[PDB]
Amino acid sequence: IENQGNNQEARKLYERAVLNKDDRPSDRSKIDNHNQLCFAGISRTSIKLGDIQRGVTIAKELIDNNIVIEIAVVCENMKQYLEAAELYQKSGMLEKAASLYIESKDFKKAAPLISMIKSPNLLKQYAKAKESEGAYNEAEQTYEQAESWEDVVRLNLDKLDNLRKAIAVLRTKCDTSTVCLMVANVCEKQGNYGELVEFLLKAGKKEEAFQKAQQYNVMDAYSDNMKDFTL
């Protein structure tokens, strides 16, 4: 009756079976196995029928882990994400629970999950959720810690303007030309342009840096470094 799609008949059939097997107390092993199967059946049919509370509860007291995992799979497939996440947490497998928590609006409980497990993809998705929310500094630090620092410097451009921290970041992230022009951008809003000179010397993009420096009269340092590359 769960194959045919008739959800309502499943409830009454399972309830009748449960009452019949509860009437007989002898040989509790087979009775308990049948009770577990029928409880799983009523849980899945109630979740499919919208009876969330009773289904999630009867999933809670049941102890068999794989059946609870399957019920959680069904309930996350239909509409219910968060309840599936707590069922995953209580069934012993929590990585998908953390993925769903960062998927949902439950960052408060997802923060400890980010705290103990070091999954970098989870960190990237959490940072994406934070930047969708609007927290620029929290997503900033989350992108800093996992590996995604290319957007860190542009977000520093937009609002943070944290030049010293950005310099520290490039000295811990093996800066390439893509961020070596991000730092050209960060030093553009200073008026001194010397740090721009050293950063673009580290870049290797040494053609427009040349003309920009000679347009700003900083030939001392730039020529000092550039007297070994081209003549």
């Binding site: 194959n3 045919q4 799609g5 899945r44 399957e70 799979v73 069904v74 497939n77």
Partner: peptide
């Protein structure tokens, strides 16, 4: 995917 219920409902 081990999505048993969807497979059953598609087979039906």
């Amino acid at each position: 995917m081990d999505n048993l219920d969807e497979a059953y409902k598609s087979v039906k």
